[PDB]
Every structure is written in structure tokens, then in C-alpha cells.
Design a protein around this ligand. Structure first.
Ligand SMILES: N=C(N)c1ccc(CNC(=O)[C@@H]2CCCN2C(=O)CNC2CCCCC2)cc1
Ligand SMILES: [Ca+2]
Length: 223
């Protein structure tokens, strides 16, 4: 997260870290058994880490739970990142509490101009590399579709939206991948892609979660 601030420990209790010997992606807890992340985060051997603040220090509120299965969206296209969403099931149910909590799925999509919260443990520099060990947060508005498409011609689909700042300086970044964009108490986006981080006229691009609620509810009820 570039140009953000320290969230404060467990203030974003639905945020998870996916670990395979190291943190490599964010995710969002949607109920005691299931995590939503980006399809480009897929790998086997995932451990889900809940209740984290400092991902390098055991602070006392963590739950570490192996994934039992992953389900990548049936139409995910790695080349275009269209339908960049996956579900991950926990081998055992998380114990929900005030530091380990689910985020609600939307009942409808958000509007352009709605303010959101984007969070993660990714790089905090727009030139160079620095990874924080505590969770970082960013307030960012949903941008118009026309500013999004103008920034990235021929590359935005109906399953994507832009959020952030066209002047730059504030953005998500590598390592934030798969994490939440929460707007008005709902998970509306997943950190997906962009050009560099915090660059002028290159805002972040997010998976448009409202398009997938039916798929999500049908898939978890059948697995
Ligand atoms: N908000 C940001 N600036 C931002 C930028 C990048 C990332 C991390 N995501 C990524 O790097 C993702 C996954 C691997 C390929 N990838 C890409 O961004 C690769 N370029 C894309 C262009 C559009 C068509 C699909 C490919 C996460 C956030
Ligand atoms: Ca920790």
C-alpha cells in the first residue's frame, strides 16, 4: 500500500494473509470456513493466517489454518485477468471473534465516487521496494468507468473497476494482491492489477465482486 497509513492491530479483522512459507497475497474472510482472494494468487499448499497485524511477529491473536481446497473462477483468464477471483476453504472452521471476523458480500454494486478502504502488507514505495510488517490501509474512491478505460484502453472489462487517485501517490501495490476493497461495509473489490504503483493516470484495477455473489454463494453451498 503506497501513501497509506498503519491501520492499527486487528482493525481490519476480515483481512487475511495467504502464506506458503512466506506471505504472498491478501484475502478476505467471508464466513468461518471460506476466504475470497484473486485467481492470480492461486497456488497449492496455502496456509491462511487470520488475526494478523505484524506478519513477522506472533502477537497472540493469530489463527493459522491450512486450506483444504481452492476454486479458481471457471472463466479466469490469466492473460487478461478477467474474472480474477478464487475461493479458498479452510480445513477447519475459524474461531470468529472481534479480531477474526467475516466481511459481508454486496447486495448490489457500489457507485463511482463511493469511498472505500483498501488494505494489505504489500510494497509501500512507488519507486523501489519496502515491505511493511504491519497492515497498511488506504481510503480511496471508486473512479468513473470512463476514467478507468481511458487509463487502460482495451484492457478493462465489465468485471473490473478502478479505484484510487489519478494524480498518483496513493495506490495498492505488489503483495496487496487478493486483498479487500471494502465500501459501505461490503466487499466490493479484490486487489487485482495496475501499471506500476501510485503512478499518475494509472489507478489500481479491482475485481468487481458484485458480479460474482451468485457464483460465490452457489459454489460454497456445494463444496
Ligand atoms: N493497484 C496497483 N497499482 C497494483 C498493481 C499490481 C498489482 C499486482 N498484480 C499483478 O501484478 C498482476 C498479477 C500478475 C500479472 N499482473 C499484472 O498486473 C500484469 N499486467 C496485466 C495487464 C492487464 C492484463 C492482465 C495483466 C497489484 C496492485
Ligand atoms: Ca503476527
Amino acid at each position: 500500500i503506497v501513501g497509506g497509513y498503519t491501520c492499527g492491530a486487528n482493525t481490519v479483522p476480515y483481512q487475511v494473509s495467504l502464506n506458503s512459507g512466506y506471505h504472498f497475497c491478501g484475502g478476505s474472510l467471508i464466513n468461518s470456513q471460506w476466504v475470497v482472494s484473486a485467481a492470480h494468487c492461486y497456488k497449492s499448499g496455502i496456509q491462511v493466517r487470520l488475526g494478523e497485524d505484524n506478519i513477522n511477529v506472533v502477537e497472540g491473536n493469530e489463527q493459522f489454518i491450512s486450506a483444504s481446497k481452492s476454486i479458481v473462477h471457471p472463466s479466469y483468464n490469466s492473460n487478461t485477468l478477467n474474472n480474477d477471483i478464487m475461493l479458498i476453504k479452510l480445513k477447519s472452521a475459524a474461531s470468529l471473534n472481534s479480531r477474526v471476523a467475516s466481511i459481508s458480500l454486496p447486495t448490489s454494486c457500489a457507485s463511482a465516487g463511493t469511498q472505500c478502504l483498501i488494505s494489505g502488507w504489500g510494497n509501500t514505495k512507488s519507486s523501489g521496494t519496502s515491505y511493511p510488517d504491519v497492515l497498511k490501509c488506504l481510503k480511496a474512491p471508486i473512479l468513473s468507468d470512463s476514467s478507468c478505460k481511458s487509463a487502460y484502453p482495451g484492457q478493462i472489462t465489465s468485471n473490473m473497476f478502478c479505484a484510487g487517485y489519478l494524480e498518483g501517490g496513493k495506490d495498492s501495490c505488489q503483495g496487496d494482491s487478493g486483498g479487500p476493497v471494502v465500501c459501505s461495509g461490503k466487499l466490493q473489490g479484490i486487489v487485482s492489477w495496475g501499471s506500476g504503483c501510485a503512478q499518475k493516470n494509472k489507478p489500481g484495477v479491482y475485481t468487481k465482486v458484485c458480479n460474482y455473489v451468485s457464483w460465490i454463494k452457489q459454489t460454497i453451498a456445494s463444496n
